[PDB]
Amino acid sequence: TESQIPKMYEMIRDQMRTLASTHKIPLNIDHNCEVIGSIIMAACTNNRDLRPVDKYWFLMGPAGAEVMTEVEIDIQPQLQWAKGAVHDPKYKGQWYPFLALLQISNKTKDTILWQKYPVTQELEISNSLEIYANGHGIKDRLKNSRPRSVGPLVHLLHLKRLQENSPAVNGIRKSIVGHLKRQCIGETQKAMINQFEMGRWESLSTFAASLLAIKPRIENHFVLTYPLIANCEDFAGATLSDEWVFKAMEKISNKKTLRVCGPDEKWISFMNQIYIHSVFQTTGEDLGVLEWVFGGRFCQRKEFGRYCKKSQTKVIGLFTFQYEYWSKPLKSAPRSIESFYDQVREECQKYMDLKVEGTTCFYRKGGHVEVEFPGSAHCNTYLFG
Amino acid sequence: TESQIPKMYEMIRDQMRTLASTHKIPLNIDHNCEVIGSIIMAACTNNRDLRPVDKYWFLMGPAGAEVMTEVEIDIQPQLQWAKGAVHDPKYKGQWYPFLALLQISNKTKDTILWQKYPVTQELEISNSLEIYANGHGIKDRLKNSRPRSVGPLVHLLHLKRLQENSPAVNGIRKSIVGHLKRQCIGETQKAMINQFEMGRWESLSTFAASLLAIKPRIENHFVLTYPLIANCEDFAGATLSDEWVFKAMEKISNKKTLRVCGPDEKWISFMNQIYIHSVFQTTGEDLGVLEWVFGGRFCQRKEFGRYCKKSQTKVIGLFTFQYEYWSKPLKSAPRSIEISCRPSFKGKRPSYNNFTSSFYDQVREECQKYMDLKVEGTTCFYRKGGHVEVEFPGSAHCNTYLFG
Amino acid sequence: TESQIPKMYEMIRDQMRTLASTHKIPLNIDHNCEVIGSIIMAACTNNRDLRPVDKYWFLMGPAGAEVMTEVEIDIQPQLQWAKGAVHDPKYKGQWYPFLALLQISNKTKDTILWQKYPVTQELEISNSLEIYANGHGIKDRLKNSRPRSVGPLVHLLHLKRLQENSPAVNGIRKSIVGHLKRQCIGETQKAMINQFEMGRWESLSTFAASLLAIKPRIENHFVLTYPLIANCEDFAGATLSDEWVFKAMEKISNKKTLRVCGPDEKWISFMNQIYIHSVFQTTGEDLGVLEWVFGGRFCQRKEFGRYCKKSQTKVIGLFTFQYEYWSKPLKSAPRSIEISCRPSFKGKRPSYNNFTSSFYDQVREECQKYMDLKVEGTTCFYRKGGHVEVEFPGSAHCNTYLFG
């Protein structure tokens, strides 16, 4: 799994810069990278969606003189490379597992700027649980490649979609349902997802209520973003379960070469934290932990108005980042304990009474030293909370 | 957007006076300015329409002795500048965006004087909906330059014309439909305008009723007319989102150097309001709205008979204008419809609760949601001489319109 | 049109042999080549129908020891070429018409063996008139690519589907009706096709009767089938309007390297004639004409019972062929129904003379006019070895057909 990780980040960045540098697209703007990366992610998984040549929004201008305009690019040099890496034996079949992680992380910024709740609204449940609906909008092949990363609600929605859409239908469903059970480690929750397999959703609100107390296991991986991938020049020790990502991304922040875009300059702090939200998948992490781990306050979405149109987003400042702690990616469920509704509420009260989460512990910057989180004054402060 | 406006009003006026003053066409008559300005704009976008020399109706006479006769004029000097201004880098590509605003406002007076409803009748809907059929008769290049100003119904008509019965047809339609959706912010309206793109128009009458209930976003900009542009000697602070246009009209109104032409002298008040109607694009606005802002009653079209021909519009009085308040032009949608928290971490707190315990119908529900709205607008008003927020208290002439 | 044909055939043969030889599929059995070529053609246009890896009925065995079994194949190397050739500029836009011709030619053997009449049955007309329903089941992109090759009844079937149930609908309908008029050269046939266009199928049975009487224009091209393409080693002069195809496939037959399959060995002559029909599109041709041209009798479908299942089809003998005459592919309709002075000059001149002195009714008049035509074809036959003009005088199997 992590054997080929150090090499994938190299040629991903190579075509990341090749497409931008071919048509004089600077890589120090996040929007240029994100849109190029949106083209880059397009070539990786959905080959037939992106055009061989097309115009996209970028920042054209030398030395801070960038003004938004639509720039045509020749993606064909980048299209031929991407299709060959799907079944390349050098990746040992890990291209699909890797691409699912890349697709989810880089779409986080679009969701943060434009706060939408597609899965929960389609599930007719509370909108503040789309945080549990990670992995929406990702390719089904990627959803069958890393279903663990894709949140249960998306699979539950796909389970709902599969019932609201042929023996091959079961094969998708069993992957959907089986990884629904794998993600939700609750003894009652596993049986309480089973009726969703049949297709009755009276407990869907109860499933919505369940997501409060019992947290489904969400496998996470530290993946850099296109504004950082193109700006990261070191990938020798690029792995997924240590402090390399924290240290390597800080080097990009220490360079202070990458710039960020927004409606106005007030978003400079907000957009800097978006990188922390996207790279470490800490969109749903507590700001107090974010303040403790990363040594700085995090701005909530409520502090800012509607995100302006991508055609009028303007460079608002340089990218910065700092951190003091870290942790191994969340492999098992965070909350661990290692009438039917009464039993569901019974297991629900079990995880509400718990006080400490985590597999082993948090780790301080500079190594894997066990440093348990003490707490912070920003309890119950979240980006969408 | 507004960067080129201060300079744009300069050469427009310079060519406006040059054409009139060349052939002893006085600039103090609206019909002189209206017809001359109508010729001026033709050179701007559709260069192949206006004749190099032609005879039109003006008011020729010294010191009030103006009479209807036709005198030929030469437009070729204006043609060269206008065609070169189409791709002139000095405007930063804002020539067509600025020209589309000019074309719509100037043709409004003819629609006011000659009450016609082309788009709505061609869209088999209510005639009172030409309020949302703004921007008819404009050049398609302009209609692709400032489609936001062009009302949805004209685009809906331009949409209807495509399905009234080539990959380039879709490109016109995709913009037209896209600018339909941008203008009409209704969640149901956005969905049920797309069904109009398919080719069905049974809910076009529902869209007729929806337009009455849900009020679409219509971008506006404060642009002067031909009689005022020729009479405006100051353009230093000429922008599109402040009181400069309101102040400029008052400065021209205080000058009283402009005359209007109509069937008879009773139309002096009607045309004075037309200047208020045309410059700020407030033809369909509530009368009580304009009376409070502009400190005077606004006459209706029913109070007067049919408008006389442009070949017999005689001087009837001096142009006057007065205003006491103003507001920024409509950018977003005026009517905007825009109890628990989900504790996600271990860190507990005092638990708080803020709660103690069809498609046509969906359109009607969105209609009903806009029925329950007591509030219009985006931010606020601004009083004359500044930008002090003075919210509308109400007026007696409310709920009444020029064509209502 | 014929410029890209040689390289087209060359790469078709290359993929034909590559996909079979990758998994040791012998190319000397008709069924192996037919199935592999069907997979290749599925890769060519409807790329989403076939699978990247799949199992199909093939004959595995060395030196005549082949038995039916399903063999997995890796179509992805062929899929990549098929999808990359879709819009390769090297074909000058002739890739789609060439693929349409290939599919039309290669979708014939299964229909011959399993005698079905889908188009006529769906059109509620005479089933024996499927002879004018060429090009059914082809991709819509291909059907627009070679609509002329697509038979008049298939276009009429698409029109009937449109009538039975958006500018795309208008475009598809107008293309269908135009190609119907092009194929059916009958003036009354054209007018009643137009009647079908708005929708009047009271003449649909009349349309069948006319097609039976008036024979519509059928464009054709000489394209080999999968087994013969895999067995063709010459593509130097590969065009579509000469004897190159005849000479090449005669040489292939003389090679005697291809085996055909069937329920029993009595079908050897039937399969040889099926190959002749598929190569020269002569399924509907008069059996006397075919016997005279190819020097051999053509067995009708009536002479053989139901074709056995593709699972139980077994090798029945080597493919053999001979011919003595050829001709170009037919371009226009095979049946074609194609003394005084006018002084403009005031001066007196002597005069000089050569001469001493219901809608269904019109449709039947045209029918009888085409009955009066005893000659079929446009230009001539050609004898083997050159383009010397020949004419068929008559044969015992005249007025007899494969399904007649």
Give A261-302 as a DSSP string.
Answer: EESSTTHHHHHHHHHHHHHS--TTS-HHHHHHHSSS----GG
H helix and E strand count, chain B: 15, 6
Distance from CA of B283 to the nearest CA of A (A): 31
The residues, any chain, with a CB within 8 Å of residue B103's CB and separated by 6 or more, are B41, B45, B138, B139, B142
Return the number of other C-beta atoms located less than 10 Å from residue C180's C-beta.
25
Residue in C30, C219, C234 with CA at minimum distance from that of residue C112: C30
> Would you list which residues of chain A are within 8 Å, Cβ to Cβ, of chain B?
126, 128-129, 131, 212, 284, 286, 288-289, 335, 354-357, 375, 379-380, 382, 385
Chain B interface mutation, best of A55, A116, A125, A128, highest count of B Cβ atoms under 10 Å: A128
* Technique used to solve these coordinates: cryo-EM
Q: Do residues B384 and B325 lie in contact, with contact meaning Cβ atoms separated by under 8 Å? A: yes
The residues, any chain, with a CB within 8 Å of residue B174's CB and separated by 6 or more, are none
- Contact assignment for B165 to C167 by CB distance below 8 Å: yes
Q: Which residue has the tokens 């480690």?
A: A185
Would you call C72 helix, strand, or coil by DSSP? Answer: strand
Distance from CA of B350 to the nearest CA of A (A): 11
A241, two tokens: 């379960």
What is the enclosing helix (H) or strand (E) of C53?
strand C53-60
The residues, any chain, with a CB within 8 Å of residue C361's CB and separated by 6 or more, are none
Return the number of other C-beta atoms located less than 10 Å from residue B183's C-beta.
26
User: Which candidate from B340, B344, B346 shows the least CB-CB separation from A382?
Assistant: B344
Distance from CA of A353 to the nearest CA of B (A): 9
Residue in B34, A125, B198 with CA at minimum distance from that of residue C168: B198
Q: Do residues C253 and C53 lie in contact, with contact meaning Cβ atoms separated by under 8 Å? A: no
Other chains touching B, judged by 3 or more CB pairs under 8 Å: A, C
Resolution (A): 18.0
- Contact assignment for B345 to A379 by CB distance below 8 Å: yes
Chain A interface mutation, best of B182, B344, B348, B351, highest count of A Cβ atoms under 10 Å: B344
Q: Do residues C384 and C246 lie in contact, with contact meaning Cβ atoms separated by under 8 Å? A: yes
Which amino acid appears at position B117 of this protein?
Answer: Y
- Contact assignment for B345 to A284 by CB distance below 8 Å: no
φ/ψ region of A24 (left if φ > 0, alpha if ψ in -120 to 50, else beta) reads left
Q: Do residues A176 and A162 lie in contact, with contact meaning Cβ atoms separated by under 8 Å? A: yes
Counted across chains B and C, CB pairs separated by less than 8 A come out at 8
Return the number of other C-beta atoms located less than 10 Å from residue B31's C-beta.
22
B196 contact residues in C (CB cutoff 8 A): none
Which amino acid appears at position C323 of this protein?
Answer: Y
The residues, any chain, with a CB within 8 Å of residue C344's CB and separated by 6 or more, are none
Distance from CA of B195 to the nearest CA of C (A): 11
B163 contact residues in C (CB cutoff 8 A): 166-167
**Angle value at C-alpha A15, between A11 and A19, nearest 5 degrees:** 170
The dihedrals phi and psi of C209, each to the nearest 5 degrees, come to: -60, -40
State how far the Cα of A57 lies from the Cα of A70, in Å rounded to an integer: 5
- Contact assignment for B347 to A129 by CB distance below 8 Å: no
State how far the Cα of C401 lies from the Cα of C404, in Å rounded to an integer: 4
- Contact assignment for B198 to C170 by CB distance below 8 Å: no
DSSP assignment letter at B329:
P
State how far the Cα of C156 lies from the Cα of C332, in Å rounded to an integer: 19
Which amino acid appears at position C6 of this protein?
Answer: P
- Contact assignment for A212 to B342 by CB distance below 8 Å: yes
**Angle value at C-alpha A264, between B98 and A377, nearest 5 degrees:** 160
Other chains touching A, judged by 3 or more CB pairs under 8 Å: B
Q: How many CA atoms lie within 13 A of A205 on its CB side?
A: 2
Counted across chains A and B, CB pairs separated by less than 8 A come out at 35
Residues β-bridged to residue A259: A29, A318
Distance from CA of B143 to the nearest CA of C (A): 22
B343 contact residues in A (CB cutoff 8 A): 212, 380
The residues, any chain, with a CB within 8 Å of residue A352's CB and separated by 6 or more, are A212, A213
Distance from CA of B151 to the nearest CA of A (A): 22
C170 contact residues in B (CB cutoff 8 A): 165
Q: Do residues C249 and C243 lie in contact, with contact meaning Cβ atoms separated by under 8 Å? A: no
Chain A interface mutation, best of B187, B345, B379, highest count of A Cβ atoms under 10 Å: B345
- Contact assignment for B347 to A379 by CB distance below 8 Å: yes
C108, two tokens: 């014939």
- Contact assignment for B198 to C167 by CB distance below 8 Å: no
- Contact assignment for B198 to C166 by CB distance below 8 Å: yes
